[PDB]
Amino acid sequence: ESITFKPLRVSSLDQIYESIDLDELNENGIISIEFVRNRTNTFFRIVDDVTTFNDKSDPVKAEMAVGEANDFLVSELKVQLEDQFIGTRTINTSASIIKDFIQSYLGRKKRDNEIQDFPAEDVQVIVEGNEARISMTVYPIRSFKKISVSLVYKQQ
Amino acid sequence: ASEAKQTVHTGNTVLLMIKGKPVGRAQSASGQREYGTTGVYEIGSIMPQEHVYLRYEGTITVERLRMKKENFADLGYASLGEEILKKDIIDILVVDNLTKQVIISYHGCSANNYNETWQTNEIVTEEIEFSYLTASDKART
Amino acid sequence: ASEAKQTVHTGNTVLLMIKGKPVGRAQSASGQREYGTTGVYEIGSIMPQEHVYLRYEGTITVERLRMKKENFADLGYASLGEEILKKDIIDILVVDNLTKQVIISYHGCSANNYNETWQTNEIVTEEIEFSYLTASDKART
Amino acid sequence: ASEAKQTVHTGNTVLLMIKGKPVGRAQSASGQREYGTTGVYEIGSIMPQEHVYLRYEGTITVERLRMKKENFADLGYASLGEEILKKDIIDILVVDNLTKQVIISYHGCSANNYNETWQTNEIVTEEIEFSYLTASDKART
Amino acid sequence: NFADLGYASLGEEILKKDIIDILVVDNLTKQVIISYHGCSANNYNETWQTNEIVTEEIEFSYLTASDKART
Amino acid sequence: ASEAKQTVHTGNTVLLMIKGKPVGRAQSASGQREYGTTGVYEIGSIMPQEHVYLRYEGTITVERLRMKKENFADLGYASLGEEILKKDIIDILVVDNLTKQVIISYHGCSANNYNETWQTNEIVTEEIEFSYLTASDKART
Amino acid sequence: ASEAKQTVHTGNTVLLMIKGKPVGRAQSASGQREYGTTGVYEIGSIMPQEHVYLRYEGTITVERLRMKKENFADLGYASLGEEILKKDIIDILVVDNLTKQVIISYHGCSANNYNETWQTNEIVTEEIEFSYLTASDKART
Amino acid sequence: DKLDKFAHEGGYYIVPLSSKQSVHAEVASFVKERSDAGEPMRAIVGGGFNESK
Amino acid sequence: AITSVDSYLLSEIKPRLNTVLENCYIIDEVLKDFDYQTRESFKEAFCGKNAQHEVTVGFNFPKFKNNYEAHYLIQLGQGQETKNSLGSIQSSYFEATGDTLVESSTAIREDDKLVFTVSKPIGELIKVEDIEFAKYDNLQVEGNKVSFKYQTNEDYENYNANIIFTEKKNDSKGLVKGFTVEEQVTVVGLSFNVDVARCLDAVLKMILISMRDSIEEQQTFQLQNLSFGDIAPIIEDGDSMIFGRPTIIKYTSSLDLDYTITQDINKLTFKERKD
Amino acid sequence: AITSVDSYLLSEIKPRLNTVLENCYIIDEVLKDFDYQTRESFKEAFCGKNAQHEVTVGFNFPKFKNNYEAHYLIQLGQGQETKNSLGSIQSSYFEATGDTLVESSTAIREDDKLVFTVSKPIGELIKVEDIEFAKYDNLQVEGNKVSFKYQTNEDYENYNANIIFTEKKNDSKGLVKGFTVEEQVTVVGLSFNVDVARCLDAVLKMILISMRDSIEEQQTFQLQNLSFGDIAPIIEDGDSMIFGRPTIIKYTSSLDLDYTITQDINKLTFKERKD
């Protein structure tokens, strides 16, 4: 879950950025706070997740929430993998066995809703003496950003 | 000569592996899966108009000769009491002796019942039955 | 000499075919059908006045030796998890070795349960049981 | 048999949503309605001349297995104490799993009964009863 | 379904639904066995469950029932 | 499967406490609530415009196997004769066994019904019904 | 498992006595109580402010196999005709078999219902219902 | 030197309570080192009062 | 593929037996349980590269004199049919395939792909050692050589791999008709010294154990069973007796024949009828 | 570990038989059911330290004359394979291990620990007699010697313990491939006096009973079964007949071979991909 759009309790702000002012910051990789007013309520909201990195091409680079999801996924996987094969005394191991273990791990995450989808066949494993190379892909989660609405008034 | 187009699997071309460790003196294993197919019967037909999948139940059994060391109890894979509650899931792999490629793997295996037989005229044997979440035959060629 | 008026079918005169592919090293198959006949009993009679058909249930089983290639899992005919939901129906044909004419065909076959046995002293075997919509013996001479 | 081709909604095909989230570990759901139908009778004849609708009653039931997190009490969709007066109406949707299309929606759901059970070896069961203002089945076409 | 087909209604649209006639028929010859005239809805029930098939139930009250055209 | 990782409260994970003691040989516990919900109807339309809450009813049930010591009668949590008028309110807690965290609490519990049974070969069963003032689920977060 | 060490009253451990005699061929016994509990409600809030006790109802049930001698009718503990008006109150005790210690006592028992059955191959069953004035559990400590 | 003290501690999020640009560079370099080393981290930074866009 | 168990046994035994007798460490491992005297005598006589005495192996009824100091004697034995399939069908193949080959092959660089060369064309690729090619690598076989994408794998330009593959014979297709046969083959060691016979039998048992990892009997001769006879005097009419302990080896193999098919459909004639 | 049942039988029989025949009390216990005459005659002939007559044991077909007053004759017999495991896998080992040894070793004082010395290094410690080391004692093995905390155990500075342990051979790791074999071995006593043969058979039965507590057959040769033949004249062509009653002994042992593994993983290369 991203910090995007979530409210904040801050009493007040020095400057109240306009819609265009906010757009310039966010497009240039600046995270800001937005003000809104209800009938009798007021909120301060985090407009979006953006890092200093500017390019919109790759969500992992731009949105820290997406990159964070990848970060914890890989780090938790590798440390577990280190324990099973490197740490624990393993007598034998094959590339395919590693491939199955990886697929088992990813399937569990989907069952826990941590990841929405992924390619099963994209995984690659190579072993070379005392070293192994692992390559895989997972689709980042996409959040809901824009809604456009139009109204039509009519008689009767 | 050896034409691979007709080869079959046997007890001498298979390995049973847990956590990378090959379980020793393992004798047999059986796997079951039930999709719970059920038919749909209309009023104006005795025949089933169609079948539908409803429920996935699967179990795997393993028979072994109790080695003096590395038995299922000593390995920590099985359990004998409340220690079970702290036992996490495991994955049981059937891997090819020749290539070390995988033939079938069971994910999220959990233990169901435990049986051991002490007998006078025969070697000691123990049997375990697991219940698994899903099966997989990936990582092929 | 060979008088056809008395010939019978055997294992050497039959082929088991799926999607045109002859399944290899297939051992046995059994077919069951239940019409669910029930009688009607009046007050003034212990005898059943008549019988009526009510429900059609049918299953077919297949026993096979797991070849290293083209096993039921690799062929995509069977399934091991949620992949089953994307598997469509199939038709299983029993066809004559001599003439390649059909003897009996099962339409709209769907899988019911899956069994595989790993054993030390014997060749690996697997068993599948299907549920079918209708059977047919058409396309004869 | 296949996912798309089955003409009937199995329990698997259906998904239940509340307020932009799925409901985990759901087990059952029932919806009952009464249009308050009555018959018109007069002196001329016994037979009812017409039928009319008087009052609309709509209730939906849900059962769930109490998760250690994200329960109705934890999630705020249901309340125990006086906080209920601070709870607004809720809208429930029953959804097609394949495409997230809507099957039926309940508008203005408010709580009537809340039941909970604990037992030695069973799973904790959480039940709740909702009364709603209207039920609509639109956006399908 | 009845909701999709309009034979049954959920919301206020019921007031826009007219009477319905039901027939129970012999499959062989499409001869009539019994007919219900002036059917109008009383109760509508629906259930969902983990591994069962979705069951839809409905209750109709009618004005008259006739068994004619058989002879 | 493991103790910590199971997302669902099994009966084993739960513990029941009264007044700083656990309740031994507990077997069942149920809690039911009714908010006294009603619908608002007017002449303009049949459909209910709004729903409101009228009265709060809360009851909890408990069953227990009569121990030779520490029963409710022995422990004073329940009374048989006129001594009930000298018994104050009681608070019940349902607890997570692992960490002694609170899951739900019942405040102001007072007794309604008390039932007891004896039988030839069954275990003595003690049942009691409590009505309470409020139920709260706090201190979890 | 042992007689003394079992913390739970099995049916075997219990003995039932009336007027200095044991009741032979007893089969069942149940005791139910209602304190006539009610809730207090006011205009200020829906929640019940307090609970109070109104009326005390106490009933005990007993079943027995009609012996050829020493039945309730034979023993005078129960009556059929107008002789009931000549029958005084009775006190029942439920006793620990090991030491003849008292477990619970019913004071002022008077009869409400008396039921009897005969059947081809079953044992004759005699049932009786007693209403009492008070129930006390004292002399244990 | 202060930031190097936090290596091998698992704190994913780190925040320096300062506006100095050079300090921000130190954290960014440090976070870069840890991420490649196998300890991912994220840094959140913000400086001064009402600073110009 | 008709099976000649005796020739396979000879081909497996000769180089493997020579290699085992080449070095002393393996022999000492084998003869751990035997006494010092017989162990050391056998090692002195037969073991080592520079051994003066040598063992031999051959079939029965040789017209020439055969050395009886230490020899492995083979005879064919009985056979039986145990299992069959429907229509005697064993497998179906689209491309004619011969034996299964294992070849070492160092990686090579090609302008778009890393590749491995092989001796002969490929009918089917079973396994590449310690590799699980993904979609990105786009594994492709083009006759003699197998190939994968150059760019993302460029670290492995000289990977010392080895390959398990299958020969390609023809593009025709056919059916495999045959059955399974349960065969028994007898093997006996001969020596006028009984201790030499015992050690020879132990060595035979060890090489039979080692053979189970061989490709051919993994693919062709599964379900190996062993049975040993009693030490008996093979001959008494000489100046000194011949002592030998026969052993019976069992195997299961699939005798089969490839039945070609000339029927190939390439056009369809869907037309209606009128009346 | 290939098994030579005959050599094990000889090694177990010779010292044990000598010890049993050494003293009269054990022999009297053995021959309780026999009559006075034969019992006392056998005791006079063979029993006692200073016995003039002596029994012998050896294998069959000896080129030299063999004493036929009282002798134990062994011959190898048949064998069969009875059970197998998947892939012929019996066990997995991280450190090469030889035989299981039992050694007596008096406790010794070291500045921080009490220790026991042993003849050879330790691969694994099975048991220390009448000891169950706790966490406080912090049992540790460091090559030749095993050690435990000095302070709280200081009363036992000279504990006359004994140790059951296993030899250490190498630090390499591998797999154990093999099967189980059900073997039959024949043993017969020879004597021109039938009563001596009967008593000899009884002694043989007793020593077979006693052997079941031996370490080696407890670990290697389980499931011992016995079968006795009829008293028959072994030879009639001499001046007087040879009488003997053959006995058949059965055993179950695991013929196996250690397959080493050179693959050792020590590094990981987790990298992502881009497209």
UniProtKB/TrEMBL annotation, chain E:
It comes from the Viruses. This is Capsid protein. The chain holds residues 72 to 142 of 142 of the full protein.
TrEMBL record, chain H:
This is Major tail sheath protein. It comes from Staphylococcus phage 812.
From TrEMBL, chains I, J:
The lineage of its organism: Viruses, Duplodnaviria, Heunggongvirae, Uroviricota, Caudoviricetes. It comes from Staphylococcus phage 812. This is Baseplate hub assembly protein. It holds the Pfam family SP10_terminator. It comes from the Viruses.
